[PDB]
Design an enzyme around this catalytic site. Structure first.
Site, short mmCIF file in Angstrom:
data_model
loop_
_atom_site.label_atom_id
_atom_site.label_comp_id
_atom_site.label_asym_id
_atom_site.label_seq_id
_atom_site.Cartn_x
_atom_site.Cartn_y
_atom_site.Cartn_z
N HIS A 1 -22.46 33.01 -19.56
CA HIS A 1 -21.59 31.90 -19.87
C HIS A 1 -21.94 31.27 -21.23
CE1 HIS A 1 -18.71 28.82 -18.19
NE2 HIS A 1 -19.03 28.36 -19.39
N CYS B 1 -15.27 32.30 -21.52
CA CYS B 1 -14.79 30.97 -21.13
C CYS B 1 -14.03 30.35 -22.30
CB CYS B 1 -15.95 30.06 -20.69
SG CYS B 1 -15.51 28.39 -20.13
N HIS C 1 -12.98 32.55 -17.48
CA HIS C 1 -12.50 31.18 -17.24
C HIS C 1 -11.41 30.92 -18.26
CE1 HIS C 1 -16.24 31.26 -15.18
NE2 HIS C 1 -16.88 30.26 -15.76
N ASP D 1 -10.42 26.87 -13.77
CA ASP D 1 -11.59 26.12 -14.24
C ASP D 1 -11.22 24.77 -14.83
OD1 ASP D 1 -14.27 25.57 -14.67
OD2 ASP D 1 -14.48 26.87 -16.45
N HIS D 2 -11.84 23.69 -14.35
CA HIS D 2 -11.64 22.33 -14.91
C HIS D 2 -10.17 21.91 -14.87
CE1 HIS D 2 -15.76 22.63 -16.33
NE2 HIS D 2 -15.67 21.64 -17.21
N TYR E 1 -13.39 19.33 -11.36
CA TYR E 1 -13.37 20.17 -10.18
C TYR E 1 -12.52 19.66 -9.03
CZ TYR E 1 -16.40 23.47 -12.33
OH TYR E 1 -16.89 24.46 -13.12
#
Ligand SMILES: [Mn+2]
Lengths: 349, 349
Positions: free
Chosen positions: A183, A221, A250, A294-295, A309
Site C-alpha cells: 500500500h 490506491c 482501491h 474505499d473511503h 468507513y
C-alpha cells in the site's frame, strides 16, 4: 481474461456495518478484512482467520484480501531484533495461504498510517469528508521512535530496511501462494520529519524490482498516489498493469493541487481522478483481482465513527464501479460478470 | 446530449429529505408532484411554486413532474369529462408558468400499478416488490364505488373504447402543452397487460406507435420505463427504446430493473445481471442518440433496515441505483468521444 471481484472493507464482529448489509450491495463479492485480536508484530493463528472466514462465507461472500497484516515499527525502523518480528510475519502469511485468501495487503509507512488535518471538512453539497490542509496545523511535532527516524534513518535507509523485509517474506509468500500488495504512503510524501518511500512511479518501479515476481505486487490506491499532483495515476496504473504487478485496487477519488488535498465522492467529476480511465484500463488489460470503493463522505445521518468507513457512500461507490466496469466490458466485446448465480428465490419458469 | 440525473421526492412530508437527495453524487433533478388538490380539480401555481422554492433553495431544480393524475371519469369517457379536462388544461398551464418542461401522466384504468407482495425476498436476502400471477388468481379486487367502476370497465369499455377515450383527452390537452412549453410523457401500464379483466392499452411497441400517432408532435411523448415494459417477456425494451428515440419521442426515462416469466415478475437491483434488462445497452442508446431530459433510477430494493413504507421509494437502493447510472453513463460517453456532465460546479468550497 478479465475477472474483477467487487469488494468491501469489514472490520469484523465489532463493525458498525454488517455483512447482511454488505451483501445487499449489488455485485458485492469480496470482504476485505483482518485479524484484530493479535498485537502488531505478533503472528496470526489459523483459528482467528478461520473465524472471520466462517462468518464471511455464511453471509454468502468470501474474503479476497487480508487488508493488513501490520508491519511492526521495529521491522520498519531496521532494528536488530527484526528477524523475530519477521518470522512472525512469515507465520501470518503462511496462515492466510492456509485459509485460501489470495492476497495480503500491507504498508511500510513509519509511525503513521495516514495523515488527515480535518475529519469533517465540508463539501460543495452538505456532506462532510476528510482532507489534508497543507496549511492548517502543519509544521508542528505530533503531541522515541519519531526522533530515531528524524535523526538517523534516511529514505535510502528505509529502502534497504524494506528490501530486507520483502526479501525475507517473499519466498514464504510464494509457497503459501499469497500475493503481497504494498500500500502506497498516504499522503505519498514526507511529513513530520518522517520519511516516505512508496510515493510514485519511480518508487513503484524500484519496489517491484526489489524482488521481481507477481507475489511481490502493489495495491494501486489511486487516491493516495494522486494526493500529490506531482503524480499521474493513469500512467502509474498502466505502467503497473503493463508489468503485471497490481494485486489489489482501491478506488477513492481526491481533489488536489499545490494547496493540499481533499477526498470527494467517487465519481470522476467530483475530484481529479478519471475513474472511467482507471477501470477502462483494468478492462483492456484483462485484470484479475479485487477492487474496493474505499473511503466515503459523510452523507445522510451516517453514524459510523471510524473515518471514511461509513457504509453509504462506499456502497454508492461500488455501484458506480458497477456501471463503469460493465459499460467498459461491453464496449470491448467482453462479457462482465458480477457473480450473480440467481435472480430469484422459489419462483422461476 | 445532456441527461440530468433526477430523483423522485414526495414534498415536505417525505422521510427522504432534499439535504439527502442533494448528497447523491451527480444528482441534479428532482421529480415531484402536488399533494393537496384532491385529483381532477385545478392545480394552483401557489401550490407548485412553493415546491420549486423548497427545491431551488436546496441546490436542486424541478426537472419533471411525476403525475398530474387523469381523473377516472376522463378515462371512462364519461359525459362530465370536459369540466375535469378543463382543470387539467390549466394544470398544464401553471406548470409551463414555472419553468418545469415535462409532465408525466398515465391512462390506466382503476390502478396506477398492481403488486401481489411488497416484501418479496431476493437471493441476496433483501426484499423487493413482486407481482405473482398465480397469487392474484384467487383475488377479487371509495370502496363500494370502485366496485362498480371496475364493473363499468369490465363490461362496457373495450380496449378500443379506452383508445378513443384517450384520443379525446390528448387532442384536448395537447395544444395547451405546446402553448405552455411543457412536454407530456405517458407512463406504460404496469403490468403492461390486462388484469382482473380490466383493459390496458399502453402495453408495448404497437401501443407506442399508435399513441405517438394520435398527435405526431414532440410534446406528445412517452415515459420510457424499461422496467414496466420488461415486466412482459413478449416485449423488447431495447428495440422499443431505440424505436422511440429515432422519433424524438422520449420526454423522460425511468430506469428500473425486473426479471419476468409466464409467472409474473419481480423488481431487482438496478444492475443488469440481477434482472432481465441490459441497462448498459439502454443508456448506450440514450447516449448514441444525444438524448435530452432527465433519467430517474426507480424503485430500489428494501435494504439496510429501511423503514420508509411507500412502494419502492426508500432512499438507499434508489440512491445505489443512481450512481450505478452515473457510471454506466460516464463510461459510455467516453466510449463514444462525447464528454459527460453532472451537477458539478465546484470540486471544493
Ligand atoms: Mn416507475
Amino acid at each position: 481474461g478479465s475477472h474483477m471481484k467487487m469488494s468491501f472493507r469489514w472490520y469484523g464482529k465489532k463493525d458498525p456495518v454488517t455483512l447482511e448489509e454488505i451483501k445487499a450491495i449489488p455485485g458485492m463479492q469480496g470482504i476485505v478484512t483482518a485479524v484484530y485480536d493479535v498485537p502488531v508484530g505478533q503472528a496470526w493463528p489459523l483459528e482467528n482467520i478461520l473465524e472471520l472466514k466462517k462468518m464471511v462465507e455464511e453471509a454468502g461472500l468470501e474474503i479476497t484480501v487480508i487488508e493488513s497484516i501490520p508491519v511492526h515499527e521495529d521491522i520498519k525502523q531496521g532494528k536488530p531484533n527484526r528477524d523475530a518480528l519477521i518470522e512472525n510475519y512469515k507465520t501470518s502469511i503462511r496462515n492466510v495461504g492456509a485459509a485460501g485468501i489470495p492476497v495480503v495487503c500491507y504498508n511500510f509507512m513509519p509511525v503513521f498510517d495516514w495523515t488527515r488535518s480535518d475529519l469533517h471538512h465540508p463539501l460543495p453539497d452538505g456532506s462532510t469528508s476528510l482532507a489534508f490542509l497543507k496549511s492548517d496545523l502543519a509544521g508542528v511535532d505530533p503531541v522515541a521512535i519519531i526522533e530515531n527516524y528524524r535523526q538517523n534513518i534516511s529514505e535510502e535507509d528505509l529502502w534497504a530496511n524494506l528490501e530486507y523485509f520483502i526479501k525475507a517474506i517473499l519466498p514464504t509468500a510464494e509457497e503459501a501462494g499469497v500475493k503481497m500488495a504494498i500500500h502506497p504512503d498516504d499522503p505519498p510524501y514526507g511529513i513530520f520529519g518522517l520519511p516516505r518511500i512508496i510515493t510514485g512511479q519511480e518508487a513503484v518501479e524500484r519496489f517491484l524490482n526489489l524482488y521481481d515476481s507477481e507475489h511481490n505486487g502493489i495495491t494501486m490506491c489511486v487516491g493516495s498516489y494522486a494526493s500529490d499532483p506531482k503524480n499521474d495515476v493513469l500512467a502509474m496504473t498502466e505502467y503497473a498493469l503493463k508489468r503485471n504487478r497490481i494485486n489489489f485496487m482501491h478506488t477513492r477519488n481526491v481533489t488536489a493541487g499545490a494547496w493540499g488535498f481533499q477526498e470527494t465522492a467517487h465519481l470522476s467529476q467530483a475530484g481529479d481522478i478519471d475513474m472511467n480511465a482507471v477501470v477502462k484500463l483494468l478492462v483492456d488489460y484483462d485484470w484479475q483481482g479485487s477492487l474496493r470503493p474505499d473511503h466515503g463522505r459523510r452523507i445522510w445521518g451516517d453514524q459510523t465513527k471510524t473515518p471514511g468507513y461509513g457504509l453509504y457512500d462506499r456502497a454508492l461507490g461500488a455501484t458506480y464501479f458497477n456501471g463503469l466496469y460493465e459499460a467498459n466490458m461491453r464496449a470491448a466485446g467482453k462479457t462482465p460478470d458480477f457473480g450473480i448465480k440467481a435472480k430469484t428465490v422459489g419462483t422461476k419458469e
